[PDB]
Paper text:
[name]-[name]-2 M pro is an indispensable enzyme in viral replication and transcription, and it is extremely critical for the cleavage of two polypeptide (pp1a and pp1ab) sequences after a glutamine residue. It has a unique feature of substrate recognition that is not shared by human proteases. Moreover, M pro is highly conserved in [name]-[name]-2, which also makes it possible to develop broad-spectrum coronavirus drugs [ 17‒ 19] .
YH-53 is a peptidomimetic inhibitor that effectively inhibits the action of M pro in [name]-[name]-2 in enzymatic and cellular antiviral assays [ 26‒ 29] . As a covalent inhibitor, YH-53 primarily utilizes the benzothiazole moiety as a warhead, and it is derived from a tetrapeptide inhibitor by the addition of a trifluoromethyl ketone fraction. In the present study, we determine the crystal structures of a benzothiazole-based inhibitor, YH-53, bound to M pro mutants from [name]-[name]-2 variants of concern (VOCs) or variants of interest (VOIs), including [name] (Beta, B.1.351), G15S (Lambda, C.37), Y54C (Delta, AY.4), M49I (Omicron, BA.5) and P132H (Omicron, B.1.1.529). The structures show that the benzothiazole group in YH-53 forms a C-S covalent bond with the sulfur atom of catalytic residue Cys145 in [name]-[name]-2 M pro mutants. Structural analysis reveals the key molecular determinants necessary for interaction and illustrates the binding mode of YH-53 to these mutant M pros. The results provided structural insights for understanding the precise inhibition mechanism of the inhibitor against different M pros and strongly indicated the potential of YH-53 to be developed as a broad-spectrum drug candidate.
Residue numbers in the entry:
A (entry chain A): 3 to 300
B (entry chain B): 3 to 301
Write the structure that this text describes.
């Protein structure tokens, strides 16, 4: 089991660059609209606390340079939606895939296509942390890179990149420009909440272990959901939701291990430790594999 | 800092499905040729001891069903180059990138595009182990998936996938059909040579960990090149060459830590352990990042 991104080609066909003055960020070109972070209109002096509405009233369609490679796409309209800019262009992207905009939940994973001046540079899988950061790899000029999942040739875009916190993790928005977590698009030092372990993903990891014959940790106990949640919080693990119980369903069916029985097994792991014994060859409990990831890799 | 793969679009547009009889695997469509593992011709009986030139001479052009998406491409010629079959089709692939076929060295990395039935499924980064295996993620039907590097719009193909060892590591060939390692395309349980750790990569990775603001493992000591190799070889690490020292220069210059200083650091980590602490979140020393990988990602 290793971290596996989705193939990036459908997304690559949509990466463009958007320039205002000398600031160039990445943008996403779908049909005749280009989506990009709104602070591309920011001057260096205007970033400590920008008045975006005032800054945008001064801009015109001809102030925006949108380029697919070195080819210019003429802007014919602009509007702001939360923290993203929506630039209407005169050409429908012929490489537009079937697509959706979705807001993901903590614990869900997605692939990030790291881009610079519109050129793709790399692809990797990320997990949204419970404190709404992602442990990404982003340099200067990466803003506007997107994160995504592909189900049956349809690309669900879920992330657009905006910021690196002082701790080195990263923060961004969905494709409607709404931040994940309590961050804002200002050149300020912001702190995320304390992070926690993604319980639903650890349980999926335990199911993967069982599937592969590693099952020493299975006990004869069960628990109620509420009892497990109260114990999980004491170990800085996320509480389980009903949605978490449901997405663990296929793995529970495949192994014949009830979700609450597996919760009692993890509960014993938290209270008593791993005893130098390993699970899937590891002494640490992995938490960035979703139940879909586990099913994908099997 | 994360295991990062090349964007896979240029390769995706080349992946097709190839069918002979009851067998289906993936092929690579470049210009007017499709490359795939030769044992797509093997029936279940053939697989234990296939006489490949004999099995292939008894196949005609119309025995091969090549599908590109929903379209079928017509095979108009075929030949075998070692463990790879080359099917000449009557249609050129317009999405053919600029490309080259290369044979990587152990310790080098590449991106794998895992495919099933000619459909791309996932992309992740692999390293050619010293024992010529790769720790990949491959299932039934993945044969014919390829590994590659990219360098300014030029795709350097280096690996085509052929098998999973009983230990779960993977084995395959370059695009000339020659295996990496002592393996052979027959249906048998095969063991690899004893693996060792890619030392130059571990060092590159500790530099990456310092560029990302983690330094707990550093120390005051230095070591000589030979004294480090003595300890390294004792722990089943590959020897470090002066070329490797040079290759690590840019990372040494950036962080101002001399290579043999970092070698002293690694030597202590090997003799004392990690004492339950982690480096870049990992509990184990990582050796699947080359010096080029860390530089490309960090700068
Ligand atoms: C004293 O202020 C701080 C104190 C402590 C930590 C801090 N972090 C940031 C911060 O992140 N700012 C945002 C920008 C804000 C407006 C969202 C930002 O630079 N995003 C980067 C991606 C960054 C850069 C390095 N790799 C990361 O992912 C990006 O691509 C963009 N470049 C520009 C250039 C010009 C105009 C717009 C953009 S948007 C500020 C900051
Ligand atoms: C007693 O024999 C064993 C004992 C102990 C461990 C073993 N491993 C293998 C072994 O790997 N076989 C080869 C096939 C050989 C001929 C190269 C193989 O590649 N199958 C897959 C990829 C595999 C499968 C699971 N994930 C891996 O990546 C593939 O795509 C192909 N399927 C077929 C099906 C029919 C014809 C050609 C191909 S080629 C045999 C074996």
């Amino acid at each position: 089991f290793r971290k596996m991104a989705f193939p990036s080609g459908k997304v690559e066909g949509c990466m463009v660059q958007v320039t205002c003055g000398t600031t160039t960020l990445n943008g996403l070109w779908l049909d005749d609209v280009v989506y990009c972070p709104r602070h591309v209109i920011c001057t260096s002096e205007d970033m400590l606390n920008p008045n975006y509405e005032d800054l945008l009233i001064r801009k015109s369609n001809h102030n925006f340079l949108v380029q697919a490679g070195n080819v210019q796409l003429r802007v014919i309209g602009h509007s702001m939606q939360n923290c993203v800019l929506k630039l209407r262009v005169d050409t429908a992207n012929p490489k537009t895939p079937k697509y959706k905009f979705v807001r993901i939940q903590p614990g869900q994973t997605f692939s990030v296509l790291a881009c610079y001046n519109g050129s793709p540079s790399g692809v990797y899988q990320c997990a949204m942390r419970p404190n709404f950061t992602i442990k990404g790899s982003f340099l200067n000029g990466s803003c506007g890179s997107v994160g995504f999942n592909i189900d049956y040739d349809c690309v669900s875009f879920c992330y657009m990149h905006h910021m690196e916190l002082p701790t080195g993790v990263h923060a961004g928005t969905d494709l409607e420009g709404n931040f994940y977590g309590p961050f804002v698009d200002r050149q300020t030092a912001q702190a995320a909440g304390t992070d926690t372990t993604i319980t639903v993903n650890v349980l999926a990891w335990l199911y993967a272990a069982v599937i592969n014959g590693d099952r020493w940790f299975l006990n004869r106990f069960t628990t109620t959901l509420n009892d497990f949640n109260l114990v999980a919080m004491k170990y800085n693990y996320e509480p389980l939701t009903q949605d978490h119980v449901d997405i663990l369903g296929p793995l529970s069916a495949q192994t014949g291990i009830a979700v609450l029985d597996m919760c009692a097994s993890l509960k014993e792991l938290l209270q008593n430790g791993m005893n130098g014994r390993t699970i899937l060859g590891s002494a640490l409990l992995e938490d960035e594999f979703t139940p879909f990831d586990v099913v994908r890799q099997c």
